[PDB]
Write an enzyme that holds these catalytic residues in place. Structure first.
Site, PDB file in Angstrom:
ATOM      1  N   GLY I  30       0.899  -1.544  -0.316  1.00 19.39           N
ATOM      2  CA  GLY I  30       0.010   0.074  -0.177  1.00 19.39           C
ATOM      3  C   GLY I  30       1.151   1.041   0.009  1.00 19.39           C
ATOM      4  N   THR I  31      -0.154   2.336   0.803  1.00 26.83           N
ATOM      5  CA  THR I  31       0.463   3.696   0.476  1.00 26.83           C
ATOM      6  C   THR I  31       1.647   3.566   2.627  1.00 26.83           C
ATOM      7  OG1 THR I  31      -1.319   4.428   1.781  1.00 26.83           O
ATOM      8  CG2 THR I  31      -1.240   4.235  -0.159  1.00 26.83           C
TER       9      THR I  31
END
Lengths: 205, 85, 233, 245, 243, 243, 242, 250, 245
Positions: I30-31
């Site tokens: 993800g981020t």
């Protein structure tokens, strides 16, 4: 309600002071007019510095109290120490859904180190009310005037022990269903100190 | 190798290397139950060799014990089997 | 292998998510091109309706959920219905319980949760359908994108279906202009038809394929259906 | 889930069979033997306990003979365990018929139920079936003496001499010949014991490798009194036929 | 066994694809909706002296305004009919009026989704999807005469004419040429017989074909053996005089 | 069925693969524990390390206080340890209401063992990996140590160790107890009991450990307490006060 | 939960489990029904090879479903009890509720319906049985003959034959019946039924069991004695056509 | 979500066997030498005590459990399977008989109740079947002293002496020869130590034998020192010193 | 090895199931999101990716509230993170009613912990593939916690997870050391913003939009509130001053 009753001393209170809160109650059971037990214990632990005063029928109060014990051991261990507000709500919840078969009048009084002494009054149908100090049972009515005048702020440990001793001894005199030993639990930053006065002591005092 | 049989193998290798009145066989009989004659000889020989690399000339019952316990395992497996403990 | 992680919906794979889930995202592109666009006071939905034959009659690609709400589908039909009923149920209850219409945002987050539950259940499946859900609540005009694995995004404009990337290039240019026209329905609507015909490159446009729905500040859920889309081309 | 963590063996086969059932009969053919001879004044029942010892009790002679009623009993060939569930439930199925109509269950009804429960374990559930075959030794006043066998498949057939267990093949080949169509108990007992020796390898036929029960009409015992022979009555009959060899 | 939630790289489920395979093996059902009726015709097929051929038909009535002809597995079409009758009966009691043919198809298609292991979205109680596709024909007072094709997949389309079955590829192709927007009930039935004759490897009799019609003064009406045969009698002579 | 390690069912050999792998690699998580018995205390030393300066090591817990008096030392990972803790805590509390009495080590051990066994037979659950050592100073037996291990097997100890320095700990205590003719040492104050523990610990694992690298849990009559960081250094310096 | 799959599609648009159900029926015994225009005859095999069966408590192949309706079968007995029981209950259910004697068509729909369910529904498999259902509708003198398969499909047939060598018995029957002139007299329709079923039983004249159903509950099972007589006769007929 | 496992995990193989029962039995053969003897003047059961550790209590350890008051059981197999099974056997024995007929179940009746537990578990999926074999040695006042074997599947058979575990057959030979009925309980204890010395070599003691008898009474096993009303237990487990005393008694 | 890549209902020899490994991996995929504990509070900040101008600010914030004083932010896959939180919420509403007090941050760690752990005892339920960083102020002090997808969780002084996990721990570890724990809550927004900047350097294929929120007992009064306006705007400037580029 249920079926069967043991009747109880019907004069309980918690009064706060400087070092915390002191809970006091009278104990004596009868079945009918037969003196089941002279000496009894009405001061029941739900948590280590948090006790309660049981009023209504002995039966109903015990059945609730077990449920409250069970939750509060698991709270203590997991979620950190309970408050009186946390107790008060558990007592209410069950009581309100089960108002049609149970009858419980509870004062939950506790000593916390993050909010000091706390008094939470549970009505017979079930409610949560904070009050600065509370009187409950049915002899509390006669002793409303006394407690409010001499109830004063930042009390000394002895002066509050006299005050509770006096309060209950006037109630035990006028009321008929009251009698037997006074048990008290002084709830302070030093632990719980437990005091017992036999019939002959408080009457004079 | 039955109990009288293991006992001999500890003794025979034990003759060949340093020994003293400490080189207690009684301890060993509990420690080893029925491993082949190859295996008992292998271990007794290795333990004298291993002590000497740990810079001990002497061999004792203590010395065999500390060498053995190191070789036998490095991971922790709880009792024996799943059949009986 | 493919066949190793494919059989039931309960397994993760080194990719970070299951193969089957990607195949559900792929189906949306097969089904019908639908573009979504908004200004800030109204939001417009434009959808191409397809049938199978001359003597077939169209399948509806707009399903009205409320008199202030509707959605477009793209992808698998049978799931799009099972979802539109759930949204109906969710809507009504809100009105019965809370006197509340049901926000686009609020609906998206409930719909997401339902989607996780059907992707942890082994006999269960991804829906295999994406939806563009539009509304005007008291949050303003809205467009949301729903994907059948629980991915919910709030957008100015977007497309699902045939060459989504196609429409997206158009919208991203004309963006700054149309969205500041706030209080004129017709312009935003006209930009919708102008867009959708350029995504197309192996299909053509016509009047009774197209169907337009607008919702807004002064437009309650209204469809222009058949003939009446001519006056927005 | 459970799709790729389980299998399906309760499905059909490319012959029309069910895997576990066909196999179940195999389990039965190496289990201990049960034999049923129906006479017309009685029922004679014989069973071989394959392998007996002086470390096993041979004293318990209900080991494969169970009474399900005082009018119906079965002889078991297969496992004790498999047997136990159908016995207990059959005895229960009895009491229900008895309560409702104040009269005991015919043999045929009770068999048809049993078979339906056994079919049931392969028919739904995915479960496994039992692996025990029963010989029904039974009564009616509609049908006289009755002799049935029912199988884990749930097919059931009427008999007047049958075997299941091991050595089935040998017993039945001698039996069909030496059969008399209407016969007394004592004659049956002679025929049975004669058959029995020559189905038991070498010198082995003993009282304490046998379980015997006979169901007689009597006239100091009641109509349909089941006598489940305890060791000593086996010892007697062997000496009378002289067949102990 | 075989996945119930496992899709193709396109994203079309195995079970759906397999549903399409049983459909293609039944005998043709052909509908033309016209402006005076809906005609549904089937090839019943089989003629034997050890067969009662005029006791079996593939055109079954749901309601006093709704029929269905089927193609594919016939055993499967019995569960579909049991669900459909119950749903239509309960709606006639609540609002006193006709249920919509599109509405019916959606209610049925909802229970076509169960197969396999259960979901947490749905309790999947069956084992396979249905292996029959249907042409449901009806009348309603708010869209008149209509004809509908329900696929067991979930999709249902309204049509003016559609053929399903084994021989549908040819049949449909003929339907279009013959179809126009001034077509009537009486012409449509004659034409049905033309199509049926053409594709048969037999002589067309009413013990291998059955007609049915919808008129709104009588609801769904079966064109009986006696009438269907009279129509067959008229066909054979007229065709056999164009040669 | 399936297979013998894709679901929990017997191995070819009558073994269970899952319980033996539960014994092995759940003590190699940088954990080593010992428990020894006092005279009027019970001492546990257990390793407990934090690899960041950014991980608050207070929340880091692997000696838990099950009740006000009961402790449970877990060898094995925090996902497992909290499934066993939740069960332990619940059991403790339930016991207290229902039977009116505080929960003994032994009863808790026995109950948890039987439960794990059931989860071992299940084909949709695992046995937990954790090894659980339950400690208090019972008024119904004195200082107690009872340990369960993962197979549904459990047994009482007088002194125990886990991790592959089991042999070292055992031998030092065994020789010592054979000489003194007791398996409990005699000393009142908790302080001297922790010093006895350390002596055998240091020799046996051959190292000393920091305050934040140790965690020491002490059982007393009607209390269980963990020693603060300074309190654990006080003891390590106090033996070195002697030196 | 055991509502999950146990019957799956074929790629050919059959079902594997229904194809395998039909095989068990073929290996099996043979049952036949031949129609007059006064009766419906049902023949059922009882080919006792072994002589150690006692045959008054050896199961029959003829069930009452109702007093004017019979069911015969070829297939596993075990499965057939389960179907036979559900079909008796359904006759009594109609009788109770409609105040009306049972009609043959609805019963056939019922028999079809339980088998159809178990292919469609999960964690159950279809029965191992094909049946013939016949009887007479109330106040009706024309014969009724239905066939149902464990696929759950159903049909009417003027005559039908099932189980082992179905081909052989259809093929024969086809030459000896016309719908335009079917038999009027019991004796000659029975003669034909016994003759077909002779040709597949091998030796049989006590191993063949005939039951002849005339309108509304006149149901009579012909005996061995009678059958032996028709077989004699058939041995006289076969040297009048030589 | 949640389980769906209802397919039986015990299934038939091409030979007529049951895979799970075959497996489970291998474990039992490898398990601890246990025997049972009916002395006719009692019943003596002995089993191997073992220790995990010298620093480990073996008081907690369970190798001989009282199923019902007059009845003990011992086993070879899988320890965890044994422990749970004892529990379900104790429960049903108490609820369903001890104020219904007013006493313990008869031995044969209790062997059937165990048999059923094991068979439920073999039939039904979600769980594998028990992997155990028991020797249930008993007294009931309506059958005398008894010895049974309980198999993993729940097949049972009557015995008057047996041994199961490792090294069974030869253990039975010594027992067969030395005892042939009508024998003091004490004498059967002596014979039992002798059979097991020949069976187990490497180190042998009475501190590695755990011995129980059913074959005595004390007033303490009526559970009161007053005026009898009932007979009470006859189960008595011996302490290690008493066993060493019988090892000294030739 | 095998069976442990499809299931969780059995135990790996590695002590770590292959399916569990795959769950962690999707978190790093993800981020970046982070969490900062300070001397009175917690401040949360996240990098929100900008891909196109068709996305709208502050409606796709990945900060979601639970109760009143817990702010919950995550790395990994969106659907997993929202379902996990929706369950937190429901337990939180239940909590509040029953005990008449707000849900703790330690309690909530347990609630989440038990839902994840439940799905790691079962092969029939699939667990979560997000790491969620959360915290707040309660009756018993300030707390930062991080929940990882095994069902491992602890309280931290500082936390990061995601793509930018490493760069974030570096920049955080310098700032925390310098301060006693992270100084004031005001200061902590500026500090946070520097951490996000360094964490962006692992993205560089998308632009970002900075989003911070806080829970502070001296400058919010115990509530979770967003940091926007002036305070966010000074924070962008501080980052761009010291960190150049």
């Amino acid at each position: 309600l249920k079926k069967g009753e043991v009747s109880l001393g019907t004069s309980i209170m918690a009064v706060t002071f400087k070092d915390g809160v002191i809970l006091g109650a009278d104990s004596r059971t009868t079945t009918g007019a037969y003196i089941a037990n002279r000496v009894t214990d009405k001061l029941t632990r739900v948590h280590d510095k948090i006790w309660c005063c049981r009023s209504g029928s002995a039966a109903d109060t015990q059945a609730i109290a077990d449920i409250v014990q069970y939750h509060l051991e698991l709270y203590t261990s997991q979620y950190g120490t309970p408050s009186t507000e946390t107790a008060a709500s558990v007592f209410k919840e069950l009581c309100y859904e089960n108002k049609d078969n149970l009858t419980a009048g509870i004062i939950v009084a506790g000593y916390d180190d993050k909010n000091k002494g706390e008094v939470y009054t549970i009505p017979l149908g079930g409610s949560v009310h904070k009050l600065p100090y509370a009187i409950a049972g049915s002899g509390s009515t006669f002793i409303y005037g006394y407690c409010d005048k001499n109830f004063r702020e930042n009390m000394s440990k002895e002066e509050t022990v006299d005050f509770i001793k006096h309060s209950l001894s006037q109630a035990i005199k006028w009321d008929g269903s009251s009698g037997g030993v006074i048990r008290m639990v002084v709830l302070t930053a030093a632990g719980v100190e437990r005091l017992i006065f036999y019939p002959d002591e408080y009457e004079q005092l | 190798r039955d109990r009288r049989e293991r006992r001999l193998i500890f003794g025979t290798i034990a003759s060949k290397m340093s020994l003293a009145p400490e080189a207690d066989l009684d301890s060993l009989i509990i420690r080893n139950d029925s491993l082949s004659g190859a295996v008992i000889a292998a271990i007794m020989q290795e333990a004298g060799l291993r002590a000497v690399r740990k810079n001990r000339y002497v061999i004792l019952q203590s010395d065999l014990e500390e060498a053995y316990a190191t070789q036998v395992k490095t991971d922790n497996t709880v009792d024996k089997f799943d059949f009986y403990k | 292998f493919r066949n190793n992680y494919d059989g039931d919906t309960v397994t993760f794979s080194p990719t970070g998510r299951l193969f089957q889930v990607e195949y559900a995202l792929e189906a949306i592109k097969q089904g019908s091109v639908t573009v979504g666009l908004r200004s800030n006071t109204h939001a417009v939905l434009v959808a191409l309706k397809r049938n199978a034959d001359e003597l077939s009659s169209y399948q509806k690609k707009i399903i009205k959920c409320d008199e202030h709400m509707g959605l477009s589908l793209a992808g698998l039909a049978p799931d799009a219905r099972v979802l539109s009923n759930y949204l109906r149920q969710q809507c009504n209850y809100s009105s019965l319980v809370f006197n509340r219409k049901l926000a686009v945002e609020r609906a998206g987050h409930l719909l997401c949760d339902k989607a996780q539950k059907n992707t942890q259940s082994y006999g269960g499946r991804p829906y295999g359908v994406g939806l563009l859900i539009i509304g005007y609540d008291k949050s303003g005009a809205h467009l949301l994108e729903f994907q059948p694995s629980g991915n919910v995004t709030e957008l100015y404009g977007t497309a699902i279906g045939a060459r989504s990337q196609g429409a997206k290039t158009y919208l991203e240019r004309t963006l700054d202009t149309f969205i500041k026209i706030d209080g004129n329905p017709d312009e935003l609507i006209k930009a919708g038809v102008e867009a959708i015909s350029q995504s197309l490159r192996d299909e053509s446009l016509t009047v009774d394929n197209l169907s337009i729905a607008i919702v807004g500040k002064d437009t309650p859920f209204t469809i222009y259906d058949g003939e009446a889309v001519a006056k927005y081309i | 889930g459970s799709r790729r963590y389980d299998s399906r063996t309760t499905i059909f086969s490319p012959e029309g069979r069910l895997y576990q059932v066909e196999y179940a009969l195999e389990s039965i053919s190496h289990a201990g033997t049960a034999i049923g001879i129906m006479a017309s004044d009685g029922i004679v029942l014989a069973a071989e306990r394959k392998v007996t010892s002086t470390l096993l009790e041979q004293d318990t002679s209900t080991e494969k003979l169970y009474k399900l009623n005082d009018k119906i009993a079965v002889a078991v060939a297969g496992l004790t365990a498999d047997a136990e569930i159908l016995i207990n439930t059959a005895r229960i199925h009895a009491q229900n018929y008895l309560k409702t109509y104040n009269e005991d269950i015919p043999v045929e009804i009770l068999v048809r139920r049993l078979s339906d429960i056994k079919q049931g374990y392969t028919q739904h559930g995915g479960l496994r079936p039992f692996g025990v075959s029963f010989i029904y030794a039974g009564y009616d006043d509609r049908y006289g003496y009755q002799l049935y066998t029912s199988n884990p498949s749930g097919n059931y057939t009427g008999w007047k001499a049958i075997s299941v267990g091991a050595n089935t093949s040998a017993a039945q080949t001698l039996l069909q010949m030496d059969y008399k169509d209407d016969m007394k108990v004592d004659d049956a007992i002679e025929l049975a014991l004669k058959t029995l020796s020559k189905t038991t390898d070498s010198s082995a036929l003993t009282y304490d490798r046998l379980e015997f029960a006979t169901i007689r009409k009597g006239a100091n015992d009641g109509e349909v009194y089941q006598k489940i022979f305890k060791p000593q009555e086996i010892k007697d009959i062997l000496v009378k036929t002289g067949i102990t060899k | 066994d075989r996945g119930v939630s496992t899709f193709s790289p396109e994203g079309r489920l195995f079970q759906v694809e397999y549903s399409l395979e049983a459909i293609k093996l039944g005998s043709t059902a052909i509908g033309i909706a016209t402006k005076e009726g809906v005609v549904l015709g089937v090839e019943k097929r089989a003629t034997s002296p050890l067969l009662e051929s005029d006791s079996i038909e593939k055109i079954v009535e749901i309601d006093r305004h709704i029929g269905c002809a089927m193609s594919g597995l016939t055993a499967d079409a019995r569960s579909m009919i049991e669900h459909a009758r119950t749903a239509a009966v309960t709606h006639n009691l609540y609002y006193d009026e006709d249920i919509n043919v599109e509405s019916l198809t959606q209610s049925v298609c909802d229970l076509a989704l169960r197969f396999g292991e259960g979901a947490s979205g749905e309790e999947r109680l069956m084992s396979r999807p249905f292996g029959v596709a249907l042409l449901i024909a009806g009348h309603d007072a708010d869209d008149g005469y209509q004809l509908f094709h329900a696929e067991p997949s979930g999709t249902f389309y309204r049509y003016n004419a559609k053929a399903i079955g084994s021989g549908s590829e040819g049949a449909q192709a003929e339907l279009l040429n013959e179809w126009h927007s001034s077509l009537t009930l009486k012409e449509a039935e004659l034409l049905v017989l033309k199509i049926l004759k053409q594709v048969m490897e037999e002589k067309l009799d009413e013990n291998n074909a059955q007609l049915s019609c919808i008129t709104k003064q009588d609801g769904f009406k079966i064109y009986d053996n006696e009438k269907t045969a009279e129509l067959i009698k008229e066909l054979k002579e007229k065709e056999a005089a164009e040669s | 069925a399936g297979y013998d390690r894709h679901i929990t069912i017997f191995s070819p050999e009558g073994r269970l693969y899952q319980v033996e792998y539960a014994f092995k690699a759940t003590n190699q998580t940088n954990i080593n524990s010992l428990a020894v018995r006092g005279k009027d205390c019970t001492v546990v030393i257990s390793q407990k390390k934090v690899p960041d300066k950014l991980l608050d090591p207070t929340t880091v817990s692997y000696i838990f206080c099950i009740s006000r008096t009961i402790g449970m030392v877990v060898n094995g990972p925090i996902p497992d340890a909290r499934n066993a803790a939740l069960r332990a805590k619940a059991e403790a509390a339930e016991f207290r209401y229902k039977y009116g009495y505080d929960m003994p080590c032994d009863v808790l051990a026995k109950r948890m063992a039987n439960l794990s066994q059931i989860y071992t037979q299940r084909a949709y659950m695992r046995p937990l990996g954790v090894i659980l050592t339950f400690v208090s100073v019972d008024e119904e037996l004195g200082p107690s140590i009872y340990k369960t291990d993962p197979a549904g097997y459990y047994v009482g100890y007088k002194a125990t160790a886990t991790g592959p320095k089991q042999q070292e700990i055992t031998t030092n205590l065994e020789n010592h107890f054979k000489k003194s003719k007791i398996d409990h040492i005699n000393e009142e104050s908790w302080e001297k009991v922790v010093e006895f523990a350390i002596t055998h610990m240091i020799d046996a694992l051959g190292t000393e450990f920091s305050k934040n690298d140790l965690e020491v849990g002490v059982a007393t009559k009607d209390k269980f307490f963990t020693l603060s960081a300074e309190n654990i250094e006080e003891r390590l310096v106090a033996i070195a006060e002697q030196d | 939960g055991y509502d999950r799959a146990l019957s799956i599609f074929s790629p050919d648009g059959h079902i594997f489990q229904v194809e395998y159900a039909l095989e068990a029926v073929k290996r099996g015994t043979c049952a036949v029904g031949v129609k007059g225009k006064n009766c419906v005859v049902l023949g059922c095999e009882r080919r006792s090879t072994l002589k150690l069966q006692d045959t008054r408590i050896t199961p029959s192949k003829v069930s009452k479903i109702d007093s004017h309706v019979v069911l015969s079968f070829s297939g596993l007995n075990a499965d057939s009890r389960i179907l036979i029981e559900k079909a008796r209950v359904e006759a009594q259910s109609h009788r109770l509720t409609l105040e009306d004697p049972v009609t043959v068509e609805y019963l056939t729909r019922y028999v079809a319906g339980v088998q159809q369910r178990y292919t469609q529904s999960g964690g159950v498999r279809p029965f191992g049985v094909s049946t013939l259902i016949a009887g007479f509708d109330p106040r009706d003198d024309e014969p009724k003959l239905y066939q149902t398969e464990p696929s759950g499909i159903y049909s009417s047939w003027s005559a039908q034959t099932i189980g082992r060598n179905s081909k052989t018995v259809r093929e024969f029957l086809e030459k000896n019946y016309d719908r335009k002139e079917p038999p009027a007299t019991v004796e000659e329709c029975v003669k034909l039924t016994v003759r077909s079923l002779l040709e597949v039983v091998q030796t049989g004249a006590k191993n063949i069991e005939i039951t002849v159903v005339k309108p509304d509950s006149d149901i009579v099972a012909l005996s061995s004695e009678e059958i032996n007589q028709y077989v004699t006769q058939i041995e006289q007929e076969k040297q009048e056509q030589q | 979500m949640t389980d769906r496992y209802s397919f039986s995990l015990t299934t038939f193989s091409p030979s007529g066997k049951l895979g799970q029962i075959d497996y489970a039995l291998t474990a039992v053969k490898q398990g601890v030498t246990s025997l049972g003897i009916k002395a006719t003047n009692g019943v003596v059961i002995a089993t191997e005590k073992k220790s995990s550790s010298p620093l480990a209590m073996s008081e907690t350890l369970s190798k001989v459990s009282l199923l019902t008051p007059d009845i003990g059981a011992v086993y070879s197999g899988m320890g965890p399977d044994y422990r749970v099974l004892v529990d379900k056997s104790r429960k049903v024995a108490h609820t369903s008989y001890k104020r219904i007929y007013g006493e313990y179940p008869p031995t044969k009746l209790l062997v059937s109740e165990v048999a059923k537990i094991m068979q439920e578990a073999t039939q039904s999926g979600g769980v594998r079947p028990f992997g155990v074999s028991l020797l249930i040695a008993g007294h009931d006042e309506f059958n005398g002293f008894s010895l049974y074997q309980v198999d993993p599947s729940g097949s049972y058979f009557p015995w008057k002496a047996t041994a199961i575990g490792k090294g069974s057959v030869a253990a039975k030979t010594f027992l067969e020869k030395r005892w042939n009925d009508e024998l003091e309980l004490e004498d059967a204890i002596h014979i039992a130590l002798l059979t097991l010395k020949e069976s187990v070599e490497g180190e042998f003691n009475g501190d590695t034998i755990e011995l129980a008898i059913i074959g005595d009474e004390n007033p303490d096993l009526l559970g009161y020192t007053g005026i009898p009303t009932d007979k009470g237990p006859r189960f008595r487990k011996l302490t290690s010193q008493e066993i060493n005393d019988r090892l000294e008694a030739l | 090895g095998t069976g442990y890549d499809l299931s969780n209902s059995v135990f790996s020899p590695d002590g770590r199931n292959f399916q569990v490994e795959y769950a962690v991996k999707a978190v790093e995929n993800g981020t970046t999101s982070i969490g900062i504990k300070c001397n009175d509070g917690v401040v949360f900040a996240v990098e929100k990716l900008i891909t196109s101008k068709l996305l709208v600010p502050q409606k796709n914030v990945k900060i979601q509230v639970v109760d009143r004083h817990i702010g919950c932010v995550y790395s990994g896959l969106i659907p997993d993170g929202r379902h996990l939180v929706n369950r937190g919420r429901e337990e939180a509403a239940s909590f509040k009613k029953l005990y008449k007090t707000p849900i703790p941050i330690p309690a909530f760690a347990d609630r989440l912990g038990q839902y994840v752990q439940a799905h790691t005892l079962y092969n029939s339920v699939r667990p979560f593939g997000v790491s969620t960083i959360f915290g707040g102020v309660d009756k018993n002090g300030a707390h930062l916690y991080m929940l990882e997808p095994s069902g491992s969780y602890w309280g931290y002084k500082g936390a990061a997870t995601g793509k930018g996990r490493q760069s974030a721990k570096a920049e955080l570890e310098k700032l925390v050391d310098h301060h006693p724990e992270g100084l004031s809550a005001r200061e902590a927004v500026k500090q946070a913003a520097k951490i996000i900047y360094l964490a962006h350097e692992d993205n560089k294929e998308k632009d970002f939009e900075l989003e911070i929120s806080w829970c502070s007992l001296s400058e919010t009064n115990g509530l979770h509130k967003f940091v926007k306006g002036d305070l966010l705007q000074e924070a962008i400037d501080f980052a761009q001053k010291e960190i150049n580029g």
